[PDB]
Amino acid sequence: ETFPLDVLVNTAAEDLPRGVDPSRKENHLSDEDFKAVFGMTRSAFANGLPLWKQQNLKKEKGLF
């Protein structure tokens, strides 16, 4: 299921939709939002970057 930034920015497990993996919120952005936010392919991000870099970027975008 895809959700807007204003939903996924939420930190409390209870304030998030059931269908969102809170540790992989980027997976629940639309393709257009993912590109807008991260500027790279889903593969470049999830596979290409080391996890620590993925986490650092997500923290900057409010998606960690």
From Swiss-Prot:
It comes from Gallus gallus (Chicken). Monomer. Homodimer. Associates with F-actin; the association with F-actin is inhibited by tropomyosin. Specifically expressed in epithelial cells. Component of brush border microvilli. The gene is VIL1. Phosphorylated on tyrosine residues. The unphosphorylated form increases the initial rate of actin-nucleating activity, whereas the tyrosine-phosphorylated form inhibits actin-nucleating activity, enhances actin-bundling activity and enhances actin-severing activity by reducing high Ca(2+) requirements. The tyrosine-phosphorylated form does not regulate actin-capping activity. It is found in: Cytoplasm, Cytoskeleton; Cell projection, Microvillus; Cell projection, Lamellipodium; Cell projection, Ruffle. Consists of a large core fragment in the N-terminal portion and a small headpiece (HP) in the C-terminal portion. The core fragment is necessary for both actin-nucleating and -severing activities, whereas the HP binds F-actin strongly in both the presence and absence of calcium and is necessary in actin-bundling activity. The Gelsolin-like 1 repeat is necessary for the actin-capping activity. The entire core fragment is necessary for the actin-severing activity. Epithelial cell-specific Ca(2+)-regulated actin-modifying protein that modulates the reorganization of microvillar actin filaments. Plays a role in the actin nucleation, actin filament bundle assembly, actin filament capping and severing. Binds phosphatidylinositol 4,5-bisphosphate (PIP2) and lysophosphatidic acid (LPA); binds LPA with higher affinity than PIP2. Binding to LPA increases its phosphorylation by SRC and inhibits all actin-modifying activities. Binding to PIP2 inhibits actin-capping and -severing activities but enhances actin-bundling activity. Changing R24A: Reduces affinity for F-actin. Residues 1-64 are annotated as: Headpiece. Belongs to the villin/gelsolin family. The chain holds residues 764 to 826 of 826 of the full protein. Residues 58-61 are annotated as: Absolutely required for activity. This is Villin-1. Residues 1-64 form the HP domain.
